[PDB]
Design a protein around this nucleic acid. Structure first.
Ligand SMILES: COC(=O)[C@H](O[C@H]1CC[C@@H](n2cc(C)c(=O)[nH]c2=O)C1)P(=O)(O)O
Ligand SMILES: OC[C@H]1O[C@@](CO)(O[C@H]2O[C@H](CO)[C@@H](O)[C@H](O)[C@H]2O)[C@@H](O)[C@@H]1O
Ligand SMILES: [Mg+2]
Ligand SMILES: [Mg+2]
Ligand SMILES: [Mg+2]
Lengths: 412, 555
DNA sequence: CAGTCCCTGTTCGGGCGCCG
DNA sequence: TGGACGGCGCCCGAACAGGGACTG
């Protein structure tokens, strides 16, 4: 019915071979059912051990949804198709998206099922369904169409997309539209009602081209930063000034203007920690001139599209989570704090899960990329529960850190 | 022509590589007898074929006796063909556990007859199977044969067999949604809530179905006969157990002895509660020869005594009742050893198990408890597909204090307190604020990379001081050492200021146990204090007492 | 700056157990 | 006799990775 665009893996690279992880009973049921109707619709078809390649699969429910979504963890395949969707058929990023007073995210992933897939490629979309208690061996499949969550899918369908979109881009000349994987980001400075309406219009407009829309509302101009702040005290103990100098000393790898000499001066003896130190003139001023530098920008930090984003998260207790996105160490393209997310005061893994999704999302809106996360958690702790809280159709890259808090830089 | 039974699975070699040419083994004639015997019997049925020298491949072969049979089993070492054969994706993702079976009114167990041999190989591939058959020593060359089916010893045999087998069973199961079939290799467990008569009908229908594909089901099948032998277990209408475990009696133990032993005991621990391998495994550390004889410590001797005694009393597991909750309770066993029971109705266990793993140079019981809870969750999710509700020997407040305060994301799923001692606690707690009226010790230590000589010392607001010389040390150790001194020489409440990141991170994670003897003594001191406040300053900033004690410990 | 050294933590391979 | 294949579990030790602190 259509011309299948060929695809090759990056040069000198082999397809993904990644073991399937245990699934809960509800997810195996949801998947067994989803895959049945996907077989009988020809979107996927069973296969066998001859195909050496495998990708992990599991299922999720979007925020407030109650309907299951199949989710493939294509991260490993995408790393090996990386060539394709950046260099050849890829998508440009709208620096205006982030300025819009509202942005709605729509799941257009269903559309990709229309197009077929290079037949030589499907060997690489292989995924196994596990059985509870290993009743059955794995029931294997591979994709006959553009799979959801492959980075190749929104690219190959870009031509189709732009055509379906073009009428509405013209009717509404100034509404920004971005496509990142299974999502369509759509934003406007219209008031809430106008905006919501126009989304519905884009929906119908998508329907008569044969697609559904099971939408998330963001507000990038509400998104704030979290500057480094020094405390406000009427009296300072020796402890206070040690803690302060440590922070400023560390801050000095970011803002080179920071000075500790006048504040260091107060610490000269060998003194008890709880002992009160009144502040000298030159220290009051040095502390002031520091407070002001921490108001400034860091000199010479800008986003370089060739480099990866890196996100670090810190657990601050009491629900609070601070983060910083950066490309090069100490040059932070953004810093932030979250509080009272879902699971606050009860579950860290759920909150951390929520934070990784919120952060990834801002990176998609702002730079059109996902960061590689450095996660403050033990690998096993995360690997046991993260899927349970995962509400999103993409999956960022991560690694795990252990970094005790000798200083609290990012949150008082 | 030859003939074709059931849909084949394409195979290939690793591109631009060629087949199995290697000479046969100097086989004792005793085996050679048993070999040509069943060799010849193959060809009638289409299993093997004779091949013109046009086939240039040779690989050795030898049989080993089938366990619990007079019969012999045939194995073709394909190792060299495996190496050059395309990689597969194994479909066997794990093992079924008995504790995962729901209760079934009627149950059948049927083994498949000559399973690998009833499955067609690939056409274009068949040639590569080439091996050559002895006759008797020095008599004649012997004929060369190519398999028409799945050889034992290929690297592709299990995956293709299991895959084909499943493909075959799909329609029957779709025809009988209410029959439970556990398919493992060639072993079939069929169960239903049917009345034993109708059920057996279905069993027969199935045997017929597998027949259409060339799959024999002899009457070496358990029919009316609980207990059924399945996967090393005995299955009874309401209970199951492991088939009895024999533990070696040896008077003098080698290394190999302890391995077999230990692995047997790990197998046993799925049902017999409280098995401990800790002291017996300690015996295997840093030993060269698997053959070497090694003596049992009074520790590993004691352990082994109680493990044998646990085995003395017969135990059994029960089956799974999806209507009721799962409950996992955990007991602390000492020396980083943990046991657990997963059950539904009190005292009737589904399975038991242990978590002994030592993770980290420095750790505590709360972390190891968390580690076991996760081990137990994944296990549950595999077997029952859901997480048990947890019963844990840790106060609810103990836990709230640990996770809220820890710098890492940590969680335990829905759980409740059980008052069975020993309870898990935190043995000490650092103050969040410097202690008024407590002596403040500034500590440092340094050491010379070349001499490996060093000093550890402290200075205080009250004038107190010390410097201690140390030998064959490191910078890190001297920093730990300085803190230890401050703990030793100080009262029940103390403020300690270090510039060491390393030392501070260790202690802040509130370890109760360490590989390091020095950390243990520090721990030991921390527990005796009423209040300890630890603070960090950067080195070399000319800070306070930190500058002074930095001088002292360089000199 | 680059290059060591401590130290700690992962990963992988090999030995045994168990299943076919 | 000495000896093949896949899956899973435990335990060990050697090899590899990366981070801070010191040293030319
Ligand atoms: O188990 C079974 O039933 C056997 O079936 C086949 C399934 C895997 C195959 N198998 C088995 C063993 C024990 C073995 O050491 N090696 C081996 O390759 C044989 P069987 O027909 O010999 O009884
Ligand atoms: O693959 C090993 C282990 O790591 C996981 C996630 O922890 O791997 C996935 O995530 C990595 C980090 O983002 C990716 O680099 C990798 O490509 C992806 O497979 C799990 O799959 C697995 O348990
Ligand atoms: Mg899979
Ligand atoms: Mg058999
Ligand atoms: Mg020093």
């Amino acid at each position: 019915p259509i011309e299948t665009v060929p695809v090759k893996l990056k040069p000198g690279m082999d397809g993904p071979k990644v073991k399937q992880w245990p699934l809960t009973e509800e997810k195996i049921k949801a998947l067994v059912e989803i895959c049945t109707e996907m077989e009988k619709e020809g979107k996927i078809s069973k296969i066998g051990p001859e195909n050496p390649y495998n990708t992990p699969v599991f299922a999720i429910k979007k925020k407030d949804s109650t309907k299951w979504r199949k989710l493939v963890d294509f991260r490993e395949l995408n790393k090996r198709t990386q060539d394709f969707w950046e260099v050849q058929l890829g998508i440009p990023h709208p620096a205006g998206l982030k300025k819009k007073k509202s942005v709605t995210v729509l799941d257009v992933g269903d559309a990709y099922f229309s197009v077929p897939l290079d037949e030589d490629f499907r060997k690489y979309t292989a995924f196994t369904i596990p059985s509870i208690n290993n009743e059955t061996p794995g029931i294997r499949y591979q994709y006959n169409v553009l799979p959801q969550g492959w980075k190749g899918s929104p690219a190959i369908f870009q031509s189709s997309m732009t055509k379906i979109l073009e009428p509405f881009k013209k009717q509404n000349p100034d509404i920004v539209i971005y496509q990142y994987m299974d999502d369509l980001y759509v934003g406007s400075d219209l008031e809430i009602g106008q905006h919501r309406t126009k989304i519905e219009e884009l929906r119908q407009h998508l329907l008569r081209w044969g697609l559904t829309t099971p939408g998330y509302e963001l507000h990038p101009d509400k998104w704030t930063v979290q500057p480094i702040v020094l405390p406000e005290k009427d009296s300072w103990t020796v402890n206070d000034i040690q803690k302060l100098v440590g922070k400023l000393n560390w801050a000095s790898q970011i803002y080179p203007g920071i000075k500790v000499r006048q504040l260091s001066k107060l610490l000269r003896g060998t003194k008890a920690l709880t002992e009160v130190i009144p502040l000298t003139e030159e220290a009051e001023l040095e502390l002031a001139e520091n407070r002001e530098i921490l108001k400034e920008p860091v000199h010479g930090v800008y986003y370089d599209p060739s480099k990866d984003l890196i996100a670090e998260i810190q657990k601050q207790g009491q629900g609070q989570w601070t983060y910083q996105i950066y490309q090069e160490p100490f040059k932070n393209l953004k810093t932030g704090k979250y509080a009272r997310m879902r699971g606050a005061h009860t579950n860290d893994v759920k909150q951390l899960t929520e934070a990784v999704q919120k952060i990834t999302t801002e990176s998609i809106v702002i730079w059109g990329k996902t960061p590689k996360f450095k996660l403050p958690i033990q690998k096993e702790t995360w690997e046991t529960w993260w899927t349970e809280y995962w509400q999103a159709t993409w999956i960022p890259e991560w690694e795990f850190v252990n970094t005790p808090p000798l200083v609290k830089l990012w949150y008082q | 022509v030859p003939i074709s039974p059931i849909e084949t699975v394409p195979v290939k070699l690793k591109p631009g590589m060629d087949g199995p040419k290697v000479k046969q083994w100097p086989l004792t004639e005793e085996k050679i007898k048993a070999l040509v015997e069943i060799c010849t019997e193959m060809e009638k049925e289409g299993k093997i074929s004779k091949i013109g020298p046009e086939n240039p491949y040779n690989t050795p072969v030898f049989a080993i006796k089938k366990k619990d049979s007079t019969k012999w089993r045939k194995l073709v070492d394909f190792r060299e063909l495996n190496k050059r054969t395309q990689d597969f994706w194994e479909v066997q993702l794990g093992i079924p556990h008995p504790a995962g079976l729901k209760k079934k009114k009627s149950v059948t167990v049927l083994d498949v007859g000559d399973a690998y041999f009833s499955v067609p190989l690939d056409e274009d591939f068949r040639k590569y199977t080439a091996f050559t058959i002895p006759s008797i020593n020095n008599e004649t060359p012997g004929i060369r044969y190519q398999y028409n089916v799945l050889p034992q010893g290929w690297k592709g045999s299990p995956a293709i067999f299991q895959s084909s087998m499943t493909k075959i069973l799909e329609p029957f199961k779709k025809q009988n949604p209410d029959i439970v079939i556990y398919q493992y290799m060639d072993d079939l467990y069929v169960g239903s809530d049917l009345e034993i008569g109708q059920h057996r009908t279905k069993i027969e229908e199935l045997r017929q179905h597998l027949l259409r594909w060339g799959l024999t089901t002899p009457d070496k099948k358990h029919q009316k006969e609980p207990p059924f032998l399945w996967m090393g277990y005995e299955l009874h209408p309401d209970k199951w157990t492991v088939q009895p475990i024999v533990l070696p009696e040896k008077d003098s133990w080698t290394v190999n002895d302890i391995c077999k032993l230990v692995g047997k005991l790990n197998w046993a621990s799925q049902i017999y509660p409280g098995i401990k391998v800790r002291q017996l495994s300690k015996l295997l550390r840093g030993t060269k020869a698997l053959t070497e004889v090694i003596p049992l410590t009074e520790e590993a001797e004691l352990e082994l005594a109680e493990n044998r005694e646990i085995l003395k009393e017969p135990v059994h597991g029960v089956y799974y009742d999806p209507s009721k909750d799962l409950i996992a309770e955990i007991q602390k066993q000492g020396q980083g050893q943990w046991t657990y029971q997963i059950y539904q109705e009190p005292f009737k266990n589904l399975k038991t198990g242990k978590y002994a793993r030592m993770r980290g140079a420095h750790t505590n019981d709360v972390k190891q408890l968390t580690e076991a809870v996760q081990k137990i969750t994944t296990e549950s999710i595999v077997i029952w597909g859901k997480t048990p509700k947890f019963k844990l020997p840790i106060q609810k407040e103990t836990w709230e204090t640990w996770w809220t305060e820890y710098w890492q994301a940590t969680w335990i799923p829905e759980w409740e307190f059980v008052n069975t001692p020993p309870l898990v606690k935190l043995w000490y707690q650092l103050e969040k604020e410097p202690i008024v009226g407590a002596e403040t010790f500034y500590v440092d230590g340094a050491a010379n990379r070349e001499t490996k000589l060093g000093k550890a010392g402290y200075v205080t607001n009250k004038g107190r001081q010390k410097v201690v010389p140390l030998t064959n040390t490191t910078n890190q150790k001297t920093e730990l050492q300085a803190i230890y001194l401050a703990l030793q020489d100080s009262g029940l409440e103390v403020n300690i200021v270090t510039n060491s990141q390393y030392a501070l991170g260790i202690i802040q994670a509130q370890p109760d146990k360490s590989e390091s003897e020095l950390v243990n003594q520090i721990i030991e001191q921390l527990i005796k204090k009423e209040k300890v406040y630890l603070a960090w300053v950067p080195a070399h900033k000319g800070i306070g007492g930190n500058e002074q004690v930095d001088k002292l410990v360089s000199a």
